[PDB]
């Protein structure tokens, strides 16, 4: 087969060719080799699966929007329903692959607290995606696991990272989104976003050369979500 360096280069080609399923397959192999990922590799894996799952989430939203309209012929409404179920199946397979990686290889072996937080946030994200399409009893499971991952990441990050750290900020972003869209708690969502942005503003001196751009960007996303939500 191929070695780690070869797999990573293949992943970069795939990314440029916009072949994200290929990319995810390569980064999956690398991860399964069992060794801790460099920042580069870690980012490659994240991007790959974000795009793979992203395509399916987008398709699911389109089909659902369409599913909202009276359709006398039961075979059209029903047709679209079965198609939606297909998409949900693909989606669950992807998310379950990611969560498998996170539990077998990535989180347990994470040395730096930054890496730990990154992987736990990833786990929260993918359980959240499952939640977006999950059903009755399964939905409870999915939502709980999401919140647990987000909560652990959040505590670790408040203890170990600076409020301007992009990983910490993005964690806050996604977690607030979780409260708003998943737990339907607009109040707590806004509270979390506002607190995060405010703490980041208080300590602008903690910014550094390597990530000040990503920091300010995410702060912007936080404030944007805030405005969109408060109404």
């Amino acid at each position: 087969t191929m070695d780690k360096s070869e797999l990573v280069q293949k992943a970069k080609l795939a990314e440029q060719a916009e072949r994200y399923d290929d990319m995810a397959a390569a980064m999956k192999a690398v991860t399964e080799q069992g060794h801790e990922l460099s920042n580069e590799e870690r980012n490659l894996l994240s991007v790959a699966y974000k795009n793979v799952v992203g395509a399916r989430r987008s398709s699911w939203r389109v089909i659902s929007s369409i599913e909202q309209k009276t359709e006398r012929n039961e075979k059209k409404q029903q047709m679209g329903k079965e198609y939606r179920e297909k998409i949900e199946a693909e989606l669950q397979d992807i998310c379950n692959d990611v969560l498998e990686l996170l539990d077998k290889y990535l989180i347990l072996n994470a040395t730096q607290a930054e890496s730990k937080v990154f992987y736990l946030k990833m786990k929260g994200d993918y359980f959240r995606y499952l939640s977006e399409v999950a059903s009755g009893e399964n939905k409870q499971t999915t939502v709980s696991n999401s919140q647990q991952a987000y909560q652990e990441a959040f505590e670790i990050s408040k203890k170990e990272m600076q409020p301007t750290h992009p990983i910490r900020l993005g964690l806050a972003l996604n977690f607030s989104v979780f409260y708003y869209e998943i737990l339907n708690s607009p109040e707590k969502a806004c509270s979390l976003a506002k607190t995060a942005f405010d703490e980041a503003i208080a300590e602008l001196d903690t910014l550094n050369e390597e990530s000040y751009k990503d920091s300010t960007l995410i702060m912007q996303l936080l404030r944007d979500n805030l405005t969109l939500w408060t109404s």
Partner: peptide, 21 residues
């Protein structure tokens, strides 16, 4: 950078329109 912001905006707005209504 503003494209990231626009994508984000659209993705949140979608939930606001289709899941809240």
């Amino acid at each position: 950078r503003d494209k990231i912001r626009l994508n984000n905006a659209i993705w949140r707005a979608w939930y606001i329109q289709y899941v809240q209504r």
